[PDB]
């Protein structure tokens, strides 16, 4: 059952309802705590959550959770989709609403492998065998 179900209010893209799965790190405690409704902050560089891993050291990088959103019913398979293209169009990220923690959701296109970075963080990780989705790093501020 999923640490987090709610609603996704970003860009232009009516808001839909989405649910959260882990996918990397040891735990989705972060992911338990996340609020009822998630906007779009702004833009980001795609760099900018790649540099932010690689400046982490180990006992750090350990706090980190990857989720992958799902649409919540067949209803939100939609504008889940227009948001993945939204972000895919314009080669950039979304800095999340979210306050307790740094949430930064980006694009992986169909059939291509988590990135590296997120791959020692361990975890049930991603099959091969998905379509365009939407994933979301989150990190600590301590």
């Not at 009822?36 to 702004?42: E, N």
């Not at 980001?44 to 350990?62: F, I, Q, R, Y």
């Not at 980190?64 to 398979?77: N, T």
């Amino acid at each position: 059952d999923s640490p987090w179900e709610g609603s996704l209010d970003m860009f232009s893209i009516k808001h839909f309802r989405a649910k959260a799965q882990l996918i990397s790190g040891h735990s989705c405690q972060l992911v338990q705590a996340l609020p009822d409704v998630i906007r779009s902050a702004g833009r980001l560089p795609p760099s900018h959550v790649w540099d932010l891993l690689d400046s982490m050291g180990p006992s750090k990088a350990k706090d980190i959770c990857v989720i992958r959103l799902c649409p919540h019913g067949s209803r939100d398979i939609q504008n889940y989709r227009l948001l993945y293209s939204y972000l895919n169009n314009k080669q950039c990220h979304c800095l999340a609403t979210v306050q307790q923690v740094k949430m930064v959701l980006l694009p992986l296109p169909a059939f291509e492998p988590l990135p590296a970075r997120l791959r020692p963080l361990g975890g049930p990780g991603l099959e091969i065998t998905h379509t365009s989705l939407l994933l979301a790093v989150l990190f600590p501020k301590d």
